[PDB]
Design a protein around this ligand. Sequence first.
Ligand SMILES: Nc1nc(O)c2nn(-c3cccc(C(=O)NCc4cc(Cl)cc(Cl)c4)c3)nc2n1
Ligand SMILES: Nc1nc(O)c2nn(-c3cccc(C(=O)NCc4cc(Cl)cc(Cl)c4)c3)nc2n1
Ligand SMILES: Nc1nc(O)c2nn(-c3cccc(C(=O)NCc4cc(Cl)cc(Cl)c4)c3)nc2n1
Ligand SMILES: Nc1nc(O)c2nn(-c3cccc(C(=O)NCc4cc(Cl)cc(Cl)c4)c3)nc2n1
Ligand SMILES: Nc1nc(O)c2nn(-c3cccc(C(=O)NCc4cc(Cl)cc(Cl)c4)c3)nc2n1
Ligand SMILES: Nc1nc(O)c2nn(-c3cccc(C(=O)NCc4cc(Cl)cc(Cl)c4)c3)nc2n1
Ligand SMILES: Nc1nc(O)c2nn(-c3cccc(C(=O)NCc4cc(Cl)cc(Cl)c4)c3)nc2n1
Ligand SMILES: Nc1nc(O)c2nn(-c3cccc(C(=O)NCc4cc(Cl)cc(Cl)c4)c3)nc2n1
Lengths: 121, 121, 121, 121, 121, 121, 121, 121
Amino acid sequence: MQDTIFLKGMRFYGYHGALSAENEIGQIFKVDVTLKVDLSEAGRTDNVIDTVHYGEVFEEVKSIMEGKAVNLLEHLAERIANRINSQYNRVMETKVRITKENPPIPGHYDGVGIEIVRENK
Amino acid sequence: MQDTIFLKGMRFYGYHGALSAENEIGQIFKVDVTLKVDLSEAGRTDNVIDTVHYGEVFEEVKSIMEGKAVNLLEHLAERIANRINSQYNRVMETKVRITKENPPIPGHYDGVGIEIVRENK
Amino acid sequence: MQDTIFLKGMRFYGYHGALSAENEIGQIFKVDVTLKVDLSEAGRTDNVIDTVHYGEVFEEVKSIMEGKAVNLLEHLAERIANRINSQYNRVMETKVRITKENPPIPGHYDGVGIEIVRENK
Amino acid sequence: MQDTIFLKGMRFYGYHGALSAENEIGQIFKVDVTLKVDLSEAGRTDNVIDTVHYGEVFEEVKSIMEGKAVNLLEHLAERIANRINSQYNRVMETKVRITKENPPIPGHYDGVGIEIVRENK
Amino acid sequence: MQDTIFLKGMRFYGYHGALSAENEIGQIFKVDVTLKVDLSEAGRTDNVIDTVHYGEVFEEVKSIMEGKAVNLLEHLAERIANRINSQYNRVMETKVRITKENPPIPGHYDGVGIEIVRENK
Amino acid sequence: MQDTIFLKGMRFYGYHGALSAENEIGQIFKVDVTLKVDLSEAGRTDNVIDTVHYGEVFEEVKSIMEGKAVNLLEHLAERIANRINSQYNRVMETKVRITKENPPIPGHYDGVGIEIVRENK
Amino acid sequence: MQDTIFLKGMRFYGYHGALSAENEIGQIFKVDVTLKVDLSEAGRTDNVIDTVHYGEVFEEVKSIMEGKAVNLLEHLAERIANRINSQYNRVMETKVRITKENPPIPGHYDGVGIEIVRENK
Amino acid sequence: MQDTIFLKGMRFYGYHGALSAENEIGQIFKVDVTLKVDLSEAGRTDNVIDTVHYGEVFEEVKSIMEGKAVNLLEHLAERIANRINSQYNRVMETKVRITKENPPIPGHYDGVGIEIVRENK
Ligand SMILES: Nc1nc(O)c2nn(-c3cccc(C(=O)NCc4cc(Cl)cc(Cl)c4)c3)nc2n1
Ligand SMILES: Nc1nc(O)c2nn(-c3cccc(C(=O)NCc4cc(Cl)cc(Cl)c4)c3)nc2n1
Ligand SMILES: Nc1nc(O)c2nn(-c3cccc(C(=O)NCc4cc(Cl)cc(Cl)c4)c3)nc2n1
Ligand SMILES: Nc1nc(O)c2nn(-c3cccc(C(=O)NCc4cc(Cl)cc(Cl)c4)c3)nc2n1
Ligand SMILES: Nc1nc(O)c2nn(-c3cccc(C(=O)NCc4cc(Cl)cc(Cl)c4)c3)nc2n1
Ligand SMILES: Nc1nc(O)c2nn(-c3cccc(C(=O)NCc4cc(Cl)cc(Cl)c4)c3)nc2n1
Ligand SMILES: Nc1nc(O)c2nn(-c3cccc(C(=O)NCc4cc(Cl)cc(Cl)c4)c3)nc2n1
Ligand SMILES: Nc1nc(O)c2nn(-c3cccc(C(=O)NCc4cc(Cl)cc(Cl)c4)c3)nc2n1
């Protein structure tokens, strides 16, 4: 099963980061969420109730990304993957990519980050 | 067999969407179609009759994307995958990605959507 | 005097638009603000009090862009230009560009909009 | 008066061109339309009837761009500028930029074209 | 073994195409070549003679892309894959992607094409 | 008179440069040519003989850009402006922009170059 | 005289900013330098000694951008414009644009900054 | 285990290359580093000591990329992969992609390079 529902380049201004200055100033966090969901029933029925509502998924990510500042990106993605897997039984597995395109790293790059993949139990 | 014929970033202005306002205003739908087709005979012969005509594939997608408004993206991709698989025996499997770069979702993102993969029976 | 302070590609999700569906669904509004300000004193002193704080300008634009839905883009830019000119005597003139990259216009384009230039009296 | 209403990157698939093969195959024409219009009344009133409707302008350009194939780009822009100036008295002057990003020119470039500016008499 | 040598976005102005007008006018062909090559010896030695010279590979592709006009893209990629596999024993497998970003297809898309993967015998 | 004919992002691989290594290795030169030409007659007639053929202009630039290696970019643009002004009486003035996006300058930038404007005598 | 020598998108990681956290963490500063210089003699002679060496200009900007942290962008551009005007008599006027694409401003934008133009006395 | 820590588009100005002129002039090297690391503990704890510090990884790559000029890209990636694997036991495998977007290759392309994948023993 290779069907997926996706949310790309979600951007939130947050204050996460292991550095005090980071939590003080904050920055933009870019998020990519991919959900493994069998989309054949919805493909057949065309009934929104037979699939996962991207809108509700963006609200979940947003609430975690725009809330309490944490240290790691690993923690933020773990909470999101867990939040989505928890509320949706149709999501067989959740992939969360978080990128800090502008960390307090002296240099020239496009970004740094982490990406986790969690299966729904 | 990893050979493929592709159609990227196809864009159509449609009126699909589960929201009444969506069907009223409409929006742009971005489509990516990938077909698994063994391209060795055509690679050998150079005869257009030994492969699938990208042009005819764009016409199929277009007819579905620019026609009757449906609710889901899942339904639109299911119809396209089914339409292409049905008319072409050389297409071993069809992958359809549909993206709503500008849905009625209050926020900052690059887009949302679904992607299905269907083998040709 | 060709000195300027600028704010590019400001993006807000608003509900302005002459169409009921627009006000219902909303969309992203892209804003570009250019202020004619003589930056020599600040260039000499390096004292933030000798120039206009881009931060405070983004807050002004934001408050207008994320507030009450209006019909025209002309109205939104008129309010911003007026809001900035009013609070800052150092701003000799304000240029406001507002773009609807995704209006309810069936077609393929990069965007539509208006740009006004207002001198500060 | 520096106020303007704009339509950027309008793209139409047409068959214009001085070469027979061009008229046969056709290509994509990119269009940029800028109109000098005093937007203060609309900025004050917020009444759509006090300005020029971008939507109606895109329809005008479209009708000319997607209609009868002509030889030059100069002819296409002349017809558009003339069509817009003619129907709208509020448009003090019209600027039309037409680009052939992919002409039958053997080489590497981003595009070629023309841009005209016509005042409304 | 996941090591690879790559050549991205190679662009050639050619006259291939199943349509007479295409062969007459010509267009730009974008090419992506990926070669599976074990790069550990070169990684150890730092001797250019222990790996495949990207330069020589671009010359091979170029000669095929800028030469005799053929009908299919499948034929062009088959000749390149075959040309590279043939001259280099270190290339375990060759992947060739050819894209016609501007075919004689009336519509809006980013491109169409084919991609083949050939193992070296 | 604000009418113009343009050629953007022309790219040639040349060997110009004041450094011996430059002339040895060569690089890509990006060129932008803008010609002030009154396009009303052509806009009226639609006869290609009433305007300047972008194709012939690209050939002129190409011949200078892909020919003998010189030291400066100033010299290359001077020769092009002079070559175009000389052959076309309809060109009232020529603007030539040449960019070295990748000069032998240790650093991070988008490019360096020169742009000249020459009126046709 | 419209001739110019330019340096675009120069990027330096600096620690300027009126906020303590800024000076602590630092960020990337994007710089655009435009110099009004009559390039006809160099265009005629092709002698590098008849124009301004872009390389030496990038070194000047770099030294100021990568040195002592200051508060304003106005101060940084004032020092650069002054540094370039001072050492080069051929530079009739200097234009310096500095952009903070990622300031400590909670929001979505492409960047903020200032641009000054200084004539050489 | 599909978890990864990444560093994209790292850019360094180096002097590596098998050609004398290359070592003389130098160029920009673009680097992409992907590390397979189980990020669940850090996702649970939120303690930076339970994962690999992207910052320290960029310093490692930088030291190799901005140091002694070598001949091959294969050698540079081998040293980096080896340097990262060596210092971090949590890194199960390292993927290094190095690209020369502007090699001394006469032509039009986006870049050339190599990518290696090394498991940590
Ligand atoms: N995996 C992970 N996830 C995060 O969110 C991290 N944040 N930091 C982090 C925290 C504090 C400072 C820095 C940092 O400064 N990185 C670049 C750098 C700069 C300097 Cl001057 C010195 C060093 Cl050692 C590193 C990084 N490391 C992380 N790893
Ligand atoms: N899988 C899928 N496919 C589609 O085509 C969908 N369309 N919508 C959809 C329909 C109607 C409204 C919205 C929507 O508004 N999403 C964002 C949003 C905004 C607000 Cl204010 C509130 C909520 Cl709950 C969601 C989404 N969900 C889909 N799922
Ligand atoms: N100057 C200006 N500013 C705005 O904010 C505008 N909004 N609209 C506007 C309002 C309502 C609908 C439309 C619209 O639909 N435009 C495209 C279009 C589609 C169709 Cl199907 C038919 C027409 Cl006539 C126009 C535009 N015109 C504006 N002009
Ligand atoms: N101003 C203008 N506007 C247009 O729309 C034009 N179309 N052509 C045009 C017509 C037919 C062919 C070509 C063309 O082929 N240009 C490139 C070229 C290729 C070759 Cl092989 C030879 C030459 Cl001389 C030119 C251009 N010149 C124009 N000028
Ligand atoms: N696999 C493959 N490879 C190629 O290189 C092809 N070239 N064409 C091709 C040849 C001639 C014309 C067209 C074409 O016009 N495609 C779009 C189109 C336009 C119109 Cl008006 C009508 C149709 Cl049926 C198709 C495509 N099909 C290919 N398939
Ligand atoms: N106006 C102009 N036009 C050109 O084409 C130029 N080419 N060079 C040029 C020639 C040779 C070397 C360099 C150069 O290396 N520039 C960057 C640089 C690097 C180093 Cl290590 C040292 C210095 Cl001083 C400059 C530039 N200066 C020019 N000016
Ligand atoms: N002209 C100019 N130039 C600079 O370099 C500036 N730096 N700052 C500056 C300094 C310190 C903080 C901020 C800032 O935070 N801006 C955004 C902002 C965020 C919040 Cl939470 C509150 C406010 Cl008032 C502003 C800006 N204003 C400048 N003006
Ligand atoms: N795998 C690999 N890695 C590198 O870093 C390489 N560098 N070169 C390399 C070295 C010297 C010159 C050239 C080169 O010039 N390539 C293009 C080219 C130009 C010309 Cl005129 C002639 C030829 Cl044969 C090749 C390439 N080949 C490599 N292979």
